[PDB]
Specification:
part of a larger assembly; 6 chains; A alpha+beta (179); B alpha+beta (116); C mainly beta (46); D mainly beta (88); E mainly beta (50); F alpha+beta (136); C: 46 residues; mainly beta; 0% helix; elongated; E: 50 residues; 4-stranded antiparallel β-sheet; binds magnesium ion; binds zinc ion; RNA-binding; tRNA binding (chain F); rRNA-binding (chain F); Ribosomal_uL16_CS (chain F); structural constituent of ribosome (chain F); tRNA-binding (chain F)
Amino acid sequence: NNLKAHYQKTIAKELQKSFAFSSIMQVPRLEKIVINMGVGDAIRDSKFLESALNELHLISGQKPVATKAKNAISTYKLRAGQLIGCKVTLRGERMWAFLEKLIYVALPRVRDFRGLSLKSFDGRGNYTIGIKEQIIFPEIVYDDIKRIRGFDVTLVTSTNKDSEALALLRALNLPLVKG
Amino acid sequence: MKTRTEQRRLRHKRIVKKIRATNHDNRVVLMVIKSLNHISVQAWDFSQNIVLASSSSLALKLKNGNKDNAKLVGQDIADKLVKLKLTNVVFDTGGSKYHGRIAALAEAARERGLNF
Amino acid sequence: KKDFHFPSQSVSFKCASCSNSFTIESTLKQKEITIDICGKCHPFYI
Amino acid sequence: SKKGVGSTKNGRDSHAKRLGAKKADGQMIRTGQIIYRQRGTRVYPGVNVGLGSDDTLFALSDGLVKYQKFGPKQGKTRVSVVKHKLDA
Amino acid sequence: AVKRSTRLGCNDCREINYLTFKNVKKNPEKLALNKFCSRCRKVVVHKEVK
Amino acid sequence: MLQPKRTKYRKPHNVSYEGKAKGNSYVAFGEYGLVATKGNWIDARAIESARIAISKCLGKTGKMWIRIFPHMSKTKKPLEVRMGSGKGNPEFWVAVVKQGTVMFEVANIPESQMIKALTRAGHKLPVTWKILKREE
RNA sequence: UUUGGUGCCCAUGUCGCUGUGGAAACACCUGGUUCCAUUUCGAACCCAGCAGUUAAGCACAGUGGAGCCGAAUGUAGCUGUUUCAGUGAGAAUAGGAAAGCACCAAGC
RNA sequence: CGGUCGCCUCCUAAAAGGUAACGGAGGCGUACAAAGGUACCUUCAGUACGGUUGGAAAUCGUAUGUAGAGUGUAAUGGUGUAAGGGUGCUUGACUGUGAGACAUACAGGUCGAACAGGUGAGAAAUCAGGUCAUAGUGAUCCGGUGGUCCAGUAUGGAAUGG
RNA sequence: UGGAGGUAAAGCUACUGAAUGUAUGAUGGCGCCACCUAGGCGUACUGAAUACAAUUAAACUCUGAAUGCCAUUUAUUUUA
Ligand SMILES: [Mg+2]
Ligand SMILES: [Mg+2]
Ligand SMILES: [Mg+2]
Ligand SMILES: [Mg+2]
Ligand SMILES: [Mg+2]
Ligand SMILES: [Mg+2]
Ligand SMILES: [Mg+2]
Ligand SMILES: [Mg+2]
Ligand SMILES: [Mg+2]
Ligand SMILES: [Mg+2]
Ligand SMILES: [Mg+2]
Ligand SMILES: [Mg+2]
Ligand SMILES: [Zn+2]
Ligand SMILES: [Zn+2]
């Protein structure tokens, strides 16, 4: 990606100067964006889960692996050995492609993207974005599951400090309130 | 969760435990350790806990990390073992999957008079 | 991994007001699909 | 008057398996003789000592048996058969 | 007692040479293993025999 | 009546009171204490009698601690029953007091009332009691 | 002697904190076109190369914080004979402790 | 009269083994073609933080945590790179045996090196004669079924036996 | 002299239960308000978790003997 090379040059220079980092790779580096569109309807409407996967596939270019619960609950109708939820973890070129596509196409189409930040870092440098609806994503046709759901896009970084993660986010211009 | 070297050490510990449990004929144990740059090999004896023979890319002075130089390393170590009059060996990796460079070293040693 | 039926092809995206033809890999029509609200067309971002 | 008496409900016990050490440390032993019968490995096997389908330790060669304490805080026991090693 | 045992017989000399166990309720399909045969002195397919 | 809320086993073997003193040997919460000179089984009923006695002869600001607790239960076969047919049912809870265990301690009221209070507590118990003080 | 690998050991070997280091090597790293691989991801495994790198890891010095180890005296239980001679714990404590023993390859 | 009658696990059982009572607690008369065999890879439960449906608790990411997780089961013992989880190929859940031992009144029970035949996994070393281990079982007689290099009451068969 | 063990004792921040006091305190009961649902300020009091000090156990053990047991070495004795 041309923006990937732009990321290289720009992130290196500003970050290096911003904290006098003694090495170019001391600057934070983003690793992997997990997407987890999971639903318990597979306990009853198994069909739905299948469609779920395809949409997830259609969004990232990686086929989603379906995850299984590690316990069993009667109230939730849960039982061990069943597949409830798919997770995809993008890396390399595809992860940066999805990140740019999200921030530039999907996110500003959000009904009311006022944003949320500073109050999202887990204290170790991660970040989770809770999407409310799937239809807003461009890689989705109107025909879909009878139920509509959101997403749990998350982020990782090489650093362990949440403040430096915020600094990388600002350098990348991820558009949130004051952050 | 870890770094590559720690996982390789863990797998190597598994292999060493198995070999020390089942090696009944007290064969010499040929542990080869592959790095990002080079790959070395040493023939220990778990009964005496010493090294009988050794060979390495540093010893052979090659820009290693290639399947080509693995054949040279295997030929040298097999020649040294033959000079030592030991031919019944057990071959274990440093914890890496037996393939590529590791497979070439083992086959070069086998084709030069070794019995394993 | 590879050998997929859903090919990630570099599709260009146009937008209103500001053209901003962003080229991104996706499994959609291979042409300049126009988006009505892009990043630059948002009161929050600018 | 007898007043009657209640009934007991637990009077069942199983046969006692004669487990424990069979060959003591320093005793000469031939191959195939039992050294330790146990339920679950209470004594680990060492050199020249095998295992069975009942976690029973038996010898694999002639020699003197020998116990050595090992493991974290010296809480694990290990048995071995040090061969005759007469070696002239 | 319950009877979960089953007999496995050769398919060359039609001799029964093995005694095994099988759950008719769980496993519905007949066993078609390959075991050693004393008569043929080789490995050969042994099938379930009534 | 002090009684354990639950027990794993209803009918345990009785616990001997013969021997020296394992724990609860020295006054460590108050500063005057009632030591025993004869190991015996004393039940929760005697504790309540002694505790009520101390509280009635206490004042408005005195404070007390009960060290021993009736952990172990004891059974009793019903009357007119011949030997056999299993162990009896648990009847009463007893605390095991060995020779040298401090049962009750008192503090925060003058010495004479405390000496008198420990005396009335010990007259309610079968063991031969003795007064002891806390080391400085 | 130092670095790297490995076996023996199984915290007086740990967890953590503060600094220093790279010549060769160890490592991150550069790419997935080849062999090979993902219950999906060249993340890992596997390739072929060392551009950048001392954040890591790794190696050294300090750090008694957590964890671990723990003397002598005395005591409880034991064996006898005494109503005293040995045997001697657990707990607690002063305190130690920033691993140790061998083999191999390189400049030494 | 009530209760029990066989086998397995713990305590009583007094730190080898063994040890009774109408002493104190429980289980078993199985399950698995994979929960067996092999090669490779991999490692808790819980909790903290951050996140649509989703809620105290479904799933995700990071960290912490030295077993409170799992090991089909009643307990005990064992086991956190294991004996737990996943994948590929398979059927050793083989044939004929078996030196030497454990424990035993007998009958029976338990472990097993090693040999020959032909296989499975694996590059090979090696492993596989059912499962992490201990309960899941009933003698003799009688008759029935399959195979068979034995007998066939003068001889050839058959009947009837072995 | 070597070894196996987990009893006596002791300990419960080394687990499983039982369990005392002090301090910080989840929690509820109890109120008084506002609000019909999100709640708030004190609680005669109940009491999670943590820290300090102290306890109990055949079926509790981070520990832990002596005696006894097995084998071997030396001396002596008996043909069992
Ligand atoms: Mg028993
Ligand atoms: Mg550094
Ligand atoms: Mg009757
Ligand atoms: Mg015993
Ligand atoms: Mg005894
Ligand atoms: Mg169990
Ligand atoms: Mg398998
Ligand atoms: Mg298994
Ligand atoms: Mg009859
Ligand atoms: Mg005839
Ligand atoms: Mg005791
Ligand atoms: Mg406790
Ligand atoms: Zn625009
Ligand atoms: Zn046949």
